[PDB]
């Protein structure tokens, strides 16, 4: 009984997708297939710095008058950038649907990058990075990406190195903007109280101008030892399947089974036919090795001794999860934008439920043995990590002598 | 690559291949070695 997500396509290739609902406020966003993976180490912070500059005024709406408009209807303006996708989204009322779309049009095209602003946003970005190091789990996940995807464009961070940040100019930005903002790589997603025909007419009216035009995991280890920190963050991952491979669903159930360290989180990060599947835990130094041992045992148990009850529990946790999420308008629009960018279509919740209920214990331990057993992991540690075991002990913990 | 996935990845099978191989290796080694010694002397 969930309403279907209807997708149309303009000549430009900008797929305009919408999923109407009763709620009177909507989350209209633009999703662009452009991240740090498309950068070539000479413009490693171009997407981040453009994400900073995108709200500082356009040609038609110069400066803060633009954001005065998004204050005037009381709407909320957000943007984010990952290694593969960039999103500019607005939460607003339903009756303010046209102007919001027009605002989004300016943000993607006709944007103005002021040289004055460029210096101010450089100091913002530089400073934030200079303090970003504070967030450990971000440092650990960046270290994990770097050591797992050495030599590839997937190792480099979204923010880029301070070097590039300082060394960036309007023209470079202009390039990234004019290169990675093509209309066939763009989705206009709407969720909530929107009509699809009105949104399609608004996309035809504005946004109809957008121009139309080997990933490798390396089993490795990075250890940033700094003994003055009170807690240690350790992430261990193996290679993921990618977006389009359905056993992701089964792997999600495996994560739902795992769900000793103060904080233990499992992740399945997916990129275009690659990814990182693993666990991040933050712990006191004198516990670290025991955690690792614990964690590896659970993975091998999922490779060898999965039972039906924990599989049923993981399926229930996954169902609830995906359905708990996909609740508010934003979460949904976000799903529409990512689904049109990655799968090329919006997968409905009934298909997700079918793919969940076809998962049993035998195929779960088969897929877990395919992806976890006897695999070389990527390890990233930060903090008092002397008792964190080196690569032979972790690699030996990636299998059992008793199977 | 097939061998790894078949007899060298599961430790139990790893042991099986080792034991079985060793069982035959002796036959081969002794035979081959003896041939050499005899040829020498």
């Amino acid at each position: 009984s969930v309403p279907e997500t209807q997708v149309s396509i303009l000549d430009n290739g900008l797929r305009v997708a919408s999923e109407q609902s009763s709620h009177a406020t909507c989350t209209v966003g633009v999703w662009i297939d452009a991240g740090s993976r498309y950068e070539t180490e000479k413009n490693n912070g171009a997407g981040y710095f453009l994400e900073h500059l995108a709200f500082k005024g356009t040609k038609n709406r110069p400066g803060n008058a633009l954001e005065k408009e998004v204050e005037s209807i009381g709407a909320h303006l957000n943007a984010y950038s990952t290694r593969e996708h960039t999103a500019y989204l607005i939460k607003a009322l339903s009756k303010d649907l046209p102007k919001v779309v027009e605002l989004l049009a300016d943000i993607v095209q006709n944007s103005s990058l002021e040289d004055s602003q460029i210096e101010k946003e450089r100091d913002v970005i530089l400073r934030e990075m200079q303090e970003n190091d504070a967030s450990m789990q971000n440092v650990v996940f960046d270290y994990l990406h770097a050591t797992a995807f050495q030599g590839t464009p997937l190792a480099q961070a979204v923010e880029g190195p301070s070097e590039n940040v300082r060394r960036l100019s309007r023209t470079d930005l202009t390039d990234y903007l004019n290169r990675h903002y093509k209309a066939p790589r763009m989705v206009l997603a709407a969720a909530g109280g929107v009509e699809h025909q009105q949104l399609l007419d608004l996309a035809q009216k504005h946004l109809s101008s957008v121009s139309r035009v080997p990933c490798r995991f390396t089993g490795s280890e990075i250890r940033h030892r700094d003994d003055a920190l009170p807690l240690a963050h350790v992430a261990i991952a193996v290679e993921g399947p990618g977006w389009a491979n359905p056993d992701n669903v089964t792997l999600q159930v495996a994560n739902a089974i795992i769900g000793l360290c103060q904080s233990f989180q499992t992740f399945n990060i997916s990129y275009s036919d690659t990814g990182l599947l693993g666990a991040h835990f933050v712990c006191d130094a004198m516990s670290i090795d025991d955690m690792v041992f614990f964690l590896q045992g659970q993975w091998m148990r999922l490779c060898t001794s999965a039972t039906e009850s924990e599989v049923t529990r993981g399926k229930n946790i996954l169902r609830n999860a995906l359905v708990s999420h996909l609740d508010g308008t934003t979460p949904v629009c976000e799903d529409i934008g990512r689904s049109l960018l990655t799968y090329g279509r919006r997968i409905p919740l009934a298909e997700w439920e079918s793919r969940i209920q076809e998962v049993d214990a035998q195929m779960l331990r088969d897929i877990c043995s395919k992806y976890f057993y006897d695999q070389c992991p990527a390890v990233a540690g930060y903090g008092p990590i002397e008792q964190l075991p080196d690569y032979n002990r972790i690699r030996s913990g990636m299998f059992w002598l008793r199977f | 690559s097939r061998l790894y996935s078949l007899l060298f990845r599961r430790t139990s099978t790893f042991a099986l291949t080792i034991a079985v191989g060793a069982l035959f290796f002796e036959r081969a080694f002794d035979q081959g070695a003896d041939a050499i010694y005899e040829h020498i002397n």
């Binding site: 990075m129 200079q130 970003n132 190091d133 971000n138 440092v139 960046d142 270290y143 770097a146 050591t147 050495q150 030599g151 190792a155 480099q156 961070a157 923010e159 880029g160 190195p161 301070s162 070097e163 080997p214 490798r216 390396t218 490795s220 990075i222 940033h224 290679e239 070389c376 930060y382 | 690559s1 790894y4 996935s5």
Partner: peptide
Amino acid sequence: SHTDVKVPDFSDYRRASKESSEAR
């Protein structure tokens, strides 16, 4: 921060692809 430098090159170490992993 933590992004200033990239993992050092191991090319003189790295061998010359799950296809190969199985063999390796």
